[PDB]
Amino acid sequence: PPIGPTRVLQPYSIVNLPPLIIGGAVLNDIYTEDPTKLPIQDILSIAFSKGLNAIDTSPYYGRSEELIGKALKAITAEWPRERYYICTKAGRITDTKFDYSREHVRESVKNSLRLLNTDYLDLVYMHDVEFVETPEVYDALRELRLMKEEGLIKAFGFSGYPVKLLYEIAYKCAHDYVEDIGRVDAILSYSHGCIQNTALFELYDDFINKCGIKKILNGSILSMSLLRSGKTHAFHPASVELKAKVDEVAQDLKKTSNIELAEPATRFAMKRWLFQTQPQKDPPLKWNQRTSIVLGVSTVEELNSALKSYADVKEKDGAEDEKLFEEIIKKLGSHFNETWPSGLYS
Amino acid sequence: MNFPPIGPTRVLQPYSIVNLPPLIIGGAVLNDIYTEDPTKLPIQDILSIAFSKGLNAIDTSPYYGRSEELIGKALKAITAEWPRERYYICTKAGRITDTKFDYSREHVRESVKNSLRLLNTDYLDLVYMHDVEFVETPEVYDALRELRLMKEEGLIKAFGFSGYPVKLLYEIAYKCAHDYVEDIGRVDAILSYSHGCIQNTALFELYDDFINKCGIKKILNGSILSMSLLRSGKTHAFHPASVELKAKVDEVAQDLKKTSNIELAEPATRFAMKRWLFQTQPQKDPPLKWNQRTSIVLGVSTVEELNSALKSYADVKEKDGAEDEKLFEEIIKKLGSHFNETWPSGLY
Amino acid sequence: FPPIGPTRVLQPYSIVNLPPLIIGGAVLNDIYTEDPTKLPIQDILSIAFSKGLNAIDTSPYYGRSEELIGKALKAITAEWPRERYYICTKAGRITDTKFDYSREHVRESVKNSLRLLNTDYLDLVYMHDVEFVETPEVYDALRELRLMKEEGLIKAFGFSGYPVKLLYEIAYKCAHDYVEDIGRVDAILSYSHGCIQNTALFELYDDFINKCGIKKILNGSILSMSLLRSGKTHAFHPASVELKAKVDEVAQDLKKTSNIELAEPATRFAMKRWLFQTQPQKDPPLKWNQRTSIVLGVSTVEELNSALKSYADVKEKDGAEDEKLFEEIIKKLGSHFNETWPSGLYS
Amino acid sequence: MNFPPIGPTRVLQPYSIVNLPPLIIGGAVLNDIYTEDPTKLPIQDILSIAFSKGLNAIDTSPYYGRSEELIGKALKAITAEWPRERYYICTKAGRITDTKFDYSREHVRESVKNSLRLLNTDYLDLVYMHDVEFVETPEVYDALRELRLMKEEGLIKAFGFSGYPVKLLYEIAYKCAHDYVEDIGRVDAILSYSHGCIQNTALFELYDDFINKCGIKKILNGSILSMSLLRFHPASVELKAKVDEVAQDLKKTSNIELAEPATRFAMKRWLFQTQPQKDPPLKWNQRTSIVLGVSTVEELNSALKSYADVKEKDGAEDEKLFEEIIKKLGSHFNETWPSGLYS
Structure with a gap:
């Protein structure tokens, strides 16, 4: 079942990025x-046809940009550029290397424009802002804001792990820096909108209303494959005890119930984020368009599975779901809402 | 020279409608x-100074008689000194007279292209749908959809609407930001009037919900003298206020003109200026800092009134004002049951 | 998951080295x-081959299957030369109701197969669904395959079809009354009789091997044409309404109660009872009985890997909990266990 | 003077070593x-008449002294009337003397090459590893892997092994079909001797298992008179003495020659009764053959006459004589002797 339109709605608004x-x-x-x-052009073309007409990349993702760029050019006939959204980042070059100077942001965004084979991007994030001093974050955002007025990008924002740093940066943009930056269009948060950490859900109203954000993106709904049986995570930044409590709950769900943690943890992030951030009545739930989730789709299996949990959450009773959700959060007990360190921010 | 500029004499880059000057x-x-x-009317003189003093914004509408026609001429007459990129132009659409409202998307786009013609320019900084309480709300949303279009093409940089009942303004603004987020979205700005003065403060209390809940970028407060109702002067022209409130206000006018030799228009102006442009955000101590999400559209008709306005602004931003609060309260007590009194308007 | 077995054709040659899957x-x-x-056919064939599934089963009855596979095989000649894998195909069924077991047509059909599959020899040819023709016509068509085997056009011959008792009659007759003219068939393909809903094949295994002298037996449709599945996924299945209902009632029971998909324990049950438990075993790792094989579709890597996974589990995991579960499914099936449907002309 | 052929006088098509004739x-x-x-020995005359009566098969071994060369000379002599294609040639490998065996993979190949030379042909229908009980069982399996390849190569059409202890033969064939199914597989034929005859019937009670459990296609029974004891024998002195006592009274109390019931018994019980039977005429089970020992053309016609009596003549009075002879045979019935390394 297709989640939404397979075209970029007009009048244009970055709020219209699809739910997935x-x-x-x-x-x-x-x-x-x-x-x-499958060839990337094929996985991209099937996904688009189901209403996932938007991709999130970054220069930190290696050949992603070129690959996606490569594959995009081949589907011009069925999928011209105006049918989809393109999201990209600047600022994190390597796992250790960061340059947020204004010249690089123009260049890196310029390099991205040539690879993705487009003369405009829908959204550029400054990538992982907790790794640099905060005055350097604002000046980079000043660069993206100018790019937006130039018509090179349609929207600008930033991403990172510690959700309160994100609030402080977004707040100041809309207040103390309202001349030079103004409200940012979107932020990307990750591993804070999932069954083990819900701190994004609690801050949603403060991001939209007090920071004036237009659109919030939730990443890593499985916390970098931690919420998954079989230790799908290798070198996860989480503490050992967190990694072992999640491990515990996962096998205890595969043993007594034949339940793979990823499907209730996926439906929970899907339901609380894409629908319940706004008042709901009864299924069929109404998608909150100020929200999207970013998730990998590297197979048609992974895709139809995401498509099914979205449809299940949108259209099925889910009283049983809520009871399953309580138990998991109960079983995690102590480590619910536990975070780890990221960057120069405590 | 005289007074120094209250702000920049240019449109800040990067462009943002919130940079509309405080006045x-x-x-x-x-x-x-x-x-x-x-x-x-010395409009080309007021325009020449006001621009030089950083009031580089004008606000008009085809409803206001020959206003658009006469600003456009005065604007042309000053081009070499004040090129169009140096100031902001706000106009409106949808109201022809006081009983004939046309909110069709066809009339809106014709109205705007005609505004463009009379003002010698290819683009407008901000356009409102005019006095939304007279039209059925479904029409109001349909008219904002066309302004939303005009903005996406680049014919206008910003869009919004105006009207007297603030609670109806909130309902519409809210609907644009939630139910109609796809094809309308948050409006850039609203113009409220006779709700941000000494007789009616209801707008100040809604400030945070307009900005926060409805996502408005910029709120504009007009008729701070309530279409000259708050003038000590005397009775007023086509004013819908009831006899009582007229009779109460001008009683406080002819009171204030016997007891401390003071004209109601002075403290009323200072009152609106302070409560709206500054105290809508936290303020330590003077110099007070302007909340750039606010503006006041001023009724100025001679150069003397313009400089007087620059006066009351500097005094509110720098003075102590503790004595001003005293007179503010006495005015409001003398209003009493007539404080915050409204009159009907439109269909709402 | 790494390969089920070798990725070559063992020497000396034997049809019993057809892989387990x-x-x-x-x-x-x-x-x-x-x-x-x-994926393109040439890839799914290349991927499955490299995991030890270096044998394809097809048929002129399967539409363009023979042509499409034949092209795909030409494409991977460089990494997968003809000698690296097995080709099995069939003959005698042309449409869903038109059969032709005539010796002339049998030879036409096989020579067509070789053309379509870009090879000068086929590993195995069966006569397709023997129950639809008068038995005498079966043996005359088998004589022609025995001749094409003699002539080296095929390495092995046999027949396929649904009633396992008819399959036994036929194979026994070839090894006895017609020993001079036919002799033991190399192989038979049985289907829907080697699954959790019907084990009749499993029980006749030793008679097929010992009394009829068959050297290799194939079990297909281990999920009974997607009937052993929670999805109500069967197309136009011939099973009675009572058996169809009873199967789906169980399928939804295992979903509700234990969040189990019937097809996983059903697939593990087929692979363990057939590929392994047809010969004596000890504790894992179980030893595959080379006189057996299973024909399963694998049109996606997900299906391939799932298949490879179920094979690895049955072969090396303890399966005590499996055995308890297998018994629950079987008693839940009740009186519908081992129920057949009519097919062709046979009683 | 004639009697019809006992069967086809060509090599039936499709080829199958099950078509080795009954004698x-x-x-x-x-x-x-x-x-x-x-x-x-008039081998040319014996072969000429035998082939015409449908005994179109000959069995030899390098161990049989000059057997192969003279058979090879004789067959070249009749290649006009009997070309190579109309008859079957079987032979053996691995046994060189009464004490020398060479089951080495490379000798097996040399012996077959020599066999093909002597017998003047490019292929052989069947090759046996000769008398396996004398070599360590691992060596037997390796030699059969060589014969399995010579079969794939087309040098030979079928392969098996031979020997005296029948339960060892079951042991090897069962393993070839199970443990070694990949590089050997089921063997085509085995040849047993002295266990399918009036003094020893062990072969008859194993027939079903050889065919059904080992998947053997064809089983041959040799020395139905047990190396002419029933007419350097490894038989115990007591065993031959007891056969004489049974032969003496037979040559006196009825004036019957023990070899003639012993021969008909071996034919009936093996070529016919190994499948269910009824009223004559009897139906030869083609999974069976007997390898005869005939030294004159008379002997050949006598054996062919025995074949026809068992196949037709009632034989109720055959059974009575058979079961009296096994009665008179006493404790020595089913007795065996030592052979090689087995048991």
Whole structure:
């Protein structure tokens, strides 16, 4: 079942990014090296046809931009540029390297425009803002704001892990820096909108109303594959005890119930974020268009599975779901809402 | 020279409608009410100084008589000194007279292209749907959809609407930001009037919900003297206020003109200026800091009134004002049951 | 998951080295080449081959299957030369109701198969669904396959179909009354009789091998044409309404009660009882009985991997909990366990 | 003087070693034992008539002394009337003397090459590993892997092994079909001897298991008179003495020659009764053959006459004589002797 329109709604608004956005990080070189995978142009074209007509990439994702850029040019006939959204980032070059100077932001965004084979991007985030001093974050945002007025980008924002730093940066943009920056169009938060950490859900009204944000994106709804049986996570930043409590709950759900943690943890992030951030009545729930979730889709399996949990959450009673949700959050008990360190911010 | 500029004498880059100056020249002084021979209103003089003093914004509407026509000429007459990129132009659409309202998307786009013609420019900074309480709300949303279009093409930089009942303004603004987020979205600005003065403060209390809940970028407060009702002067022209409130106000006018030799228009102006442009955000101590999300559209008809306005503004931003609060309260007590009294308007 | 077995054709040659899992080629048809989620045929064949599934089963009855697989095989000649894998196909069924077991047509059909599959020899040819023709015609068609085997056009011959007792009659007759002219068939393909809903094949295994002298037996439709599945996924299945209902009642029971998909324990039950428990075993790792194989479709890597996973589990995990579960499914099935449906002309 | 052929006088198509005829000419007679001067034996005359009566098969071994060469000379002599295609040739490998065996993979290949040379042909229908009980069982399986390849190569059409202890033969064949199904597979035929005869019937009670459990296609029964004891024998002295006592009274109390019931019993019980039977005429089970020892053309016609009596003549009075002979045979019935390394 298609989640939404397969075209960019007019009049244009970055609020119209679809409820599910392709996590374009997955389309890297390990992808083009796996004999099992479809050509990127095919996974992109199927996803688009189901209402996932938007991708999130970054220069930090290696050959993603070029690959996605490569694949985009081939589907021009069925999928011209005006049919989809393109989201990209600047500022994180490597796992350790950061340059937020204004010249680079223009360049990196310029480099992205050539690879993605477009003369405009829908959304550019400054990537992972907790890794730099905060005055450098504002000046970078001043650059993106000028790019937006130039018509090179339609919207600008930033991302990062610690959700209160995000609030402080967004707040100041809309207040103390309202001349130079103004409200940012969108923020991307991750691993704070999931069954083990809901701190994004509690801050949603403060982001929309007090920071004037137009659109909030929730990433890592499985917390970098932590909310998943079988230790799908290798070098997760979470503490050992968090990683072991999640492990515990996952096997205890595969053993007594044959339940894979990822499906109730997916439906929970889907339901609380995309629908319940606004008053609901009874199924069928109404999507809150100020929200989207970014998730990888590297197979048609992964895609129809996301499509099914979205449809399940949107259209089914889910009283049983709520009872399952309480138990998981209960079982995690102590480590619910536990965070880890990221960057220079405590 | 005289007074120093209250702000920049240019449109800040990057462009943002919130950079509309704290005070805006209001074009309704040129109407068929408020004078005859408005061709003899010194608009090209007020315009020349006000721009130099950082009031580089004008606000008008085709409803205000020959206003648009006469601003456009005065604007042309000053081009080499004040090129169009140096100031902001706000106009409106949808009201022809006082009983004939046309909110069709066809009339709106014709109205705007005609505004463009009379004001010698290819683009307008901000356009409102005019006095939304007279039209059925479904029409109001349909008219904002066309302004939303005009903004996306680049014919206008910003869009919004105006009207007397503030609670109806909130309902519409809210609907644009939630139910009609796809095809309308948050409006950039609203113009409220006779709700931000010494006789009616209801607008100040709604400030945070307008900005926060409805996502408005900029709120504009007009008729801070309530279409000259708050003038000590005397009785007033086509004013819908009841006899009582008229009779109460001008009683406080002819009171204030016996007891401390003071004209009601002075403290009323200072009152609106302070409560709206500054105290809508936290304020330590003077110098007070302007909340750039606010503006006042001023009824100025002679250069003397313009400089007087620059006066009351500097005094509110720098003075102590503890003595001003005293007189504010006495005015409001003398209003009493007539404080916050409204009159009907439109269909709402 | 790494390969089920060798990725070559063992020497000396023997039809009993057909791998434990064999690609069912029916689904490699039009509705495949058109599907955008589907890989190209040449790849899914290459991927399955490299995991030890280096055998394809197909049939002129399967539409364009033979042509499409035949092209796909030409494409991967460099990494997968003809000698690296097995080709099995069939003959004698042309449409869903038109059969032709005539010796002349049997030879036409096989020579067509070789053309379509870009090879000069086929590993195995069956006569398709023997129950639809008068038995005498079966043996005359088998004589022709025995001749094509003699002539080296095929490495092995046999027949396929649904009533397992008729399959036994036929194979026994070839090894006895017609020993001079036919002799033991190499192989038979049985289907819907080697699954959790019908084990009749499992019980006749030793008679087929010992009394009839068959060297290799194939079990297909281990989910009974997607009947052993929660999805009510069967197309136009011939099973009675009572059995269909009883199967789906169980399918929804296992979903509600234990969040179990019937097809997983059903697939594990088929693979363990057939590929392993047809010969003595000890504790895991279980030893595959090379006289057996299963024909399963694998049109996606997900299906391939799922298949590979169920094989690895049955082969190396304890399966004590499996056995308790298998018994629950079987008693839940009740009187519908081992129920058949009519097919062809046979009693 | 004639009697019809006992069966086809060509090689049936499709080819199958199950079509080895019910009686096969045993070339062990051309041995250095069993007659002095092998050149005397009228092998050309014996073969000429045998092929015409449908005994279109001969069995030999390098171990049989000059058997192969003289059989090879004789067959080249009749290649006009009998070309290679109309008859079957079987032979053996691995046994060189009464004590020397070479089951080495490379010798097995040399012996077959020599066999093909002597017998003047490019292929052989069947090759046996000879008398397996004398070599360590691992060596047997390796030699059969060689024969399995020579079969794939087309040098031979079928392969098996031979020997005395029948339960060892079951042991090897069962393993070839199960443990070693990948590089050997089921063997085509085995040849047993001295266990399918009036003094020993062990072969008859294993027939079903050889065919059904080992998947063997064809089983041959040799020395139905058990190396002419019933007419350097490894038989115990007591065993031969007891057979004489049974032969003496037979040659006196009824004036019957023990070899003639012993021969008909071996034919009936093996070529016919190994499948269900009823009223004559009897139906030869094609999974069986007997390898005869015939040294004159008379002997050949006598055996062919025995075949027809068992196949037709009632034989109620055959059964009575059979079961009296096993009665008279006493405790020695089913007795065996030692052979090689087995047990």
